[PDB]
Design a protein around this ligand. Structure first.
Ligand SMILES: *[C@@H]1O[C@H](CO)[C@@H](O)[C@H](O)[C@H]1NC(C)=O
Lengths: 212, 224
């Protein structure tokens, strides 16, 4: 089987810069049977370049394919924030039609501090015997952000779970969602529920809290 | 519209068989080849096999040669991919691709792709989600904008679909990826930022669909 190796695994570039992606096969593949695909978050793959250097229909002219034999190149002349995705190359002239491991393209941008919002558990959930307190960090960059929970000035650890969206295709920011899970009994015993947020865009940690 | 529409999500016990559908629209289906590719959560694409147009002549990768059968039906314009002897490592999103064709000519590569079918293999039973409101308040307002959302909690398996106001609301929506809770069930939250002055005169409804459990819930989020 023909092995397809893409490099680098991840490429973080500023918008407007030129992206360069490598695709290499363990043996020579015919150029008319090498394709490039673009898979954006939550979307099916999209054919970018086929025949090594032929742009598919609807593909902007800033995408460019080149190479032959065992070394193929994808070039994005001016990178746009919408171009963030995983880019796969595939050979389909020799079975099995193997894929590469793909190259993830991130977008760089200025530091952006998050907007912090907290949500108390709903009375409908409290009827079920459980309580979920949600902390929302909205539209920030870079992705690194620290979220700590405090319940009556008691640091919570091991009972919260976080989740980060993929990078936004327009403003290139991230959004995080942390969920604190407590029993209805434990939730009714305490008053001050707070999530503290540490991030590069903040001069000092920001705390959002509410009283039960 | 040149389209490739696959079937819905699946839950299959280990050792059972799944058969994913892939119906075509817009182009001549009989003239079109079809390849099948899967991708596990957070991995690379894996080629399964392909089938030539007209006949049932198929070709598979050595990994799936023994238990994958790729077929096609010209009368109903639908190609199928049946994977038997399902095990844990088969949990992935399965895609079908095809070149578009008219009555005589075809594209030289695979440009038409299906939306993907998520198949999950586990002994765990299916469970529908509970939708709770993330109501907006003074503690979720900054500037002139407020945040509200929906907590889609305790469901299995993946995935769930969340839209707002039947798809009329897209600007400012963030549907976070699910987390696997210690109970074995998933939990997801979708939020949206709206201007504060709209909370009183505009209704906000999150539309939650969990196809594996046939659970559709329209939860209205009201201010607290
Ligand atoms: C099929 O499409 C090709 C373009 O790829 C065109 O030249 C040809 O006339 C079309 N034939 C029919 C019957 O639609």
């Amino acid at each position: 089987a023909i092995r397809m190796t893409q490099s680098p695994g991840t490429l973080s570039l500023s918008p407007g810069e030129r992206a360069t992606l490598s695709c290499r096969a363990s043996q020579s593949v015919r150029s008319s049977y090498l394709a490039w695909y673009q898979q954006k978050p939550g979307q099916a793959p999209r054919l970018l370049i086929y025949g090594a250097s032929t742009r598919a229909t609807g593909i902007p002219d800033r995408f460019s394919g080149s190479g032959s034999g065992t070394d193929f190149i994808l070039t994005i002349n001016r990178l746009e924030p919408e171009d963030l995705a995983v880019y796969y190359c595939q050979q389909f002239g020799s079975s099995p039609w193997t894929f590469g491991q793909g190259t993830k393209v991130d977008i760089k941008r200025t530091v952006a501090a998050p907007s912090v919002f907290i949500f108390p558990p709903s009375d409908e959930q409290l009827k079920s015997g459980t309580a979920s307190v949600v902390c929302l960090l909205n539209n920030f960059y870079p992705r690194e952000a620290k979220v700590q929970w405090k319940v009556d000035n008691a640091l919570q650890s091991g009972n919260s779970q976080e989740s980060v969206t993929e990078q936004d295709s327009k403003d290139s920011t991230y959004s995080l969602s942390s969920t604190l899970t407590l029993s209805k009994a434990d939730y009714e015993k305490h008053k001050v529920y707070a999530c503290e947020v540490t991030h590069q865009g903040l001069s000092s940690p920001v705390t959002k809290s509410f009283n039960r | 519209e040149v389209q490739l529409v696959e079937s819905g999500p699946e839950v299959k016990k280990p050792g059972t068989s799944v058969k994913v559908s892939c119906k075509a629209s817009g182009f001549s289906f009989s003239m079109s080849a079809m390849q099948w590719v899967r991708r596990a959560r957070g991995q690379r694409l894996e080629w399964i096999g392909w089938i030539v147009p007209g006949s049932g002549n198929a070709n598979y990768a050595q990994k799936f040669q023994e238990r994958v059968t790729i077929t096609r039906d010209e009368s109903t314009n639908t190609g199928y991919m049946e994977l038997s002897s399902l095990r844990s490592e088969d949990t992935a999103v399965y895609y079908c691709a095809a070149p578009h064709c008219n009555k005589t000519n075809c594209y030289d590569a695979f440009d038409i792709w299906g939306q993907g079918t998520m198949v999950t293999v586990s002994s765990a039973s299916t469970k529908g989600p509970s939708v709770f409101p993330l109501a907006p308040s003074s503690k979720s307002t900054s500037g002139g904008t407020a945040a509200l959302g929906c907590l889609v909690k305790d469901y299995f398996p993946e995935p769930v679909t969340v839209s707002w106001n039947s798809g009329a609301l897209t600007s400012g929506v963030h549907t976070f990826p699910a987390v696997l809770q210690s109970s074995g069930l998933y939990s997801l939250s979708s939020v949206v930022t709206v201007p504060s002055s709209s909370l009183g005169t505009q209704t906000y409804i999150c539309n939650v669909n969990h196809k594996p459990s046939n659970t559709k819930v329209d939860k209205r989020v009201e201010p607290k």
